[PDB]
Amino acid sequence: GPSVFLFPPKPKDTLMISRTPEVTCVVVDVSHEDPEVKFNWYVDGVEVHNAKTKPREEQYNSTYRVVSVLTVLHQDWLNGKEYKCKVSNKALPAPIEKTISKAKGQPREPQVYTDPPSREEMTKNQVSLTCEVKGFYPSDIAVEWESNGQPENNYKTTPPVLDSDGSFFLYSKLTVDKSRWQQGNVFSCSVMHEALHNHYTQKSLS
């Protein structure tokens, strides 16, 4: 019969109050004989009624796919509230229930350190600026680079790695030509994480 998938908000949407985090409940393999789909949403077991369900959409494999979106409150998600999607369909023996929440566990604030290019690499035409983020929990995190208000997008970040103390770490490598680095330009590593003050911090390098 039908199958339900429940997806969390985009991590960056949970960390910036300016943005609207949403949870998305997707039902696939809805038949033509049983096309009616009913969604019920609960927040910590309390039924809520402000969800937005889109009209069914027929797929190329002859099934219907229907989606329901519930906006979530910034503080609710961060405070660990649980979001239950309940899907009812005539072709089902009983309704399907899916629950989702923010990654659970005691939060731990990242420590952010920047490291300049080593001497050996300062013989190359391009040098690595490194941002070390360690000791954070949970693993949800965003890292960007900037200089003079404008973003520096020639960077790559490792996934979070589980450390031996149960927290996470990662590294972010921004590559700039010596041209800008030897002029003394300030480059900034920006880190977003729930456990930071305002979920934000930045460390500069020069």
Ligand X SMILES: *[C@@H]1O[C@H](CO[C@@H]2O[C@@H](C)[C@@H](O)[C@@H](O)[C@@H]2O)[C@@H](O[C@@H]2O[C@H](CO)[C@@H](O[C@@H]3O[C@H](CO[C@H]4O[C@H](CO)[C@@H](O)[C@H](O)[C@@H]4O[C@@H]4O[C@H](CO)[C@@H](O)[C@H](O)[C@H]4NC(C)=O)[C@@H](O)[C@H](O[C@H]4O[C@H](CO)[C@@H](O)[C@H](O)[C@@H]4O)[C@@H]3O)[C@H](O)[C@H]2NC(C)=O)[C@H](O)[C@H]1NC(C)=O
Binding-site residues for Zn(2+) sit at 32, 74, 82, 199
Identify the burial level of 61 via C-beta atoms within 10 angstroms of its C-beta, where 0-12 means exposed, 13-18 middle and 19 or more buried. exposed
Identify the burial level of 77 via C-beta atoms within 10 angstroms of its C-beta, where 0-12 means exposed, 13-18 middle and 19 or more buried. buried
* CB nearer to a second copy: pick between 2 and 117: 117
Q: Which does 32 bind (CB under 5 to 8 A by kind): ligand X, a second copy, Zn ion, none?
A: Zn ion
Identify the burial level of 133 via C-beta atoms within 10 angstroms of its C-beta, where 0-12 means exposed, 13-18 middle and 19 or more buried. buried
What is the rounded CA–CA span in Å between residue 156 and residue 179?
Answer: 20
Residues annotated within the binding site are 32, 74, 82, 199
170 makes contact with a second copy (CB under 8 A): yes
Cβ-Cβ contacts under 8 Å for 63 (sequence gap 6 or more):
28, 29, 30, 31
Element containing residue 15 per DSSP (H, E): helix 11-15
**What's the distance, CA 198 to chain centroid?**
16
Nearest-CA neighbor of 143 among 192, 76, 74?
192
Q: x/- contact string, 89-128, with a second copy (CB under 8 A)?
A: ----------------------x-xxx--x-xx------x
Candidate residues 14, 68, 157, 190; the one interacting with a second copy per rule CB under 8 A = 157
* CB nearer to a second copy: pick between 137 and 169: 169
Q: Mark the segment that binds Zn ion (CB under 5 A) among 24-32, 127-135, 139-147, 180-188.
A: 24-32
Nearest-5° angle of CA 57, CA 62, CA 67? 25
64 makes contact with a second copy (CB under 8 A): no
Q: What residues make contact with ligand X under the rule CB under 6 A?
A: 3, 5, 7, 24, 26, 28-29, 59-61, 63, 65
197 makes contact with Zn ion (CB under 5 A): no
Q: What does the binding site for a second copy look like in residue numbers (CB under 8 A)?
A: 111, 113-115, 118, 120-121, 128, 130, 132, 134, 154, 156-159, 161-164, 169-171, 173, 175
